């Protein structure tokens, strides 16, 4: 297979195209579609390119009993090599907005189709998350934590957006809007700020409830999450050390620099006070010279 | 009450507004808050041979105020002055504190009595004796970080080690000189040590200029206007 597929980049056409599909099948409710993705990789960057349905059909009484079809598979990849030489089959996406456990059987018929481990595109299409429209997942196989198996998985992986220099032309245009975040002026980043605050509770606040549950509500206890925070722990800025100590130093440094760039524009102010005061005072002149020229006029009839 | 306006107010009229202002406040034993006003009342006002009583007056009454805190006038002041030969008390009134001597202001206040009393200005001149203590003591805490009693006493001419320590104690609940006393060694500590940059307090020090900055912004904008609807009606060719 292929090893190297770390990074997910996935075009603006991938999700709009992925969206078409759920609804112009009339599947809906939870009943899922499968479809390819085609596109390159045997590297790092995985571009998804183009993305199309496949007929698939979903079982409600077991929920690991489906149909996915074979033929329709090898007609598409004839075709569409001639559109670009740029689509090969590089996995498949599944129209979410959640990942399943039957998705990991699913699964083990696209890595027989290609020979690369082959990428899982969730698609959220029901956007109840704030973020993640995009999930990658790349099944994998590891040996797992608490005595147990080689057992299948799905490992996430960074899921970006970079886009295509075609898909950005189409995607400025259609926009019209102030954006999500763009990061342009002060406004849009002071809103910024405030925004990431409530970004970092949220994450935070889904893993106080994990842990409650393992202690509590017996989900097992799995050892990288664990793990992960002795790191955010170690990384965490202890006052009163002098790395914290210089940061207040600082403070008062940028805040100099400001205190300066305030009062450097009052200069810019002053200079334009003064422009329309002097403005004001030819407007006065103008005036007196009006009520002047009316007489000279008044007394040109009775001249002639 | 709070009922001075600023709309229909002009430069001599603001001017003499601060000037009772600072005359209450000096008066009721607050310095800072009356140096505050007189030097907004100078800075109003013209400078011309008209306004000349207002400023003579309004010169008089900052440098007492400002010797009251027991910060200094400078030399230059007096001798570039227009006005120097009415200042001439006031001038050794600056002398005579910054140089400690008890014996200099007994004198000064005695052959200038009836100047002062004029002026109305020798009320404040009386608490003026209790910073020719205070100033001396002053130098001697810039001058000398340890230093003993008894070495003080001499200088400023004092009785005892009691007497020094009495004026000492209550000198720095103000906090003028900026020490300590150890009477458990006989010697006077001075306790500026500096490092206000490694203090939490330069933020906020910023924070006063740059709301300063942003009050002249505003004071701009909305008097730029103002003349200009008047002007945009007025009739031209």
Redesign the interface.
Known sequence: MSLQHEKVTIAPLVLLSALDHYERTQTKENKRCVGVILGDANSSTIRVTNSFALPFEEDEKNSDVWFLDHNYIENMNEMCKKINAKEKLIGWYHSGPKLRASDLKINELFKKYTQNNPLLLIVDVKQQGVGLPTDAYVAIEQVKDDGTSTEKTFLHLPCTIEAEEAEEIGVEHLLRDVRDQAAGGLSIRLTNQLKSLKGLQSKLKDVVEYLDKVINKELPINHTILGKLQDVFNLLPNLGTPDDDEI??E??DR??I??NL??A??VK??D??MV??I??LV??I??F???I?NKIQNKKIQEQ | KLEYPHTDVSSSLEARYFFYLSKINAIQLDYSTANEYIIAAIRKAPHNSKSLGFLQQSNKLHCCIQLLMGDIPELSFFHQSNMQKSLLPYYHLTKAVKLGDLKKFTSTITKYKQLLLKDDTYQLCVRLRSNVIKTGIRIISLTYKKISLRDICLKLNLDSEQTVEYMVSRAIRDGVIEAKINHEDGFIETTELLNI??S?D??QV??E??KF??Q??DE??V??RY??DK??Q????
């Open positions: 207040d130093v403070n008062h805040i100099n400001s205190n305030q009062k524009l009052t102010t002053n334009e006070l329309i005061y403005s004001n407007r006065s103008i005036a010279d009006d009520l020229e | 940059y490694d939490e330069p933020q910023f924070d200029r740059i900055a942003n002249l912004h701009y904008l008097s730029m003349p200009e002007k945009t007025q009739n031209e060719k």
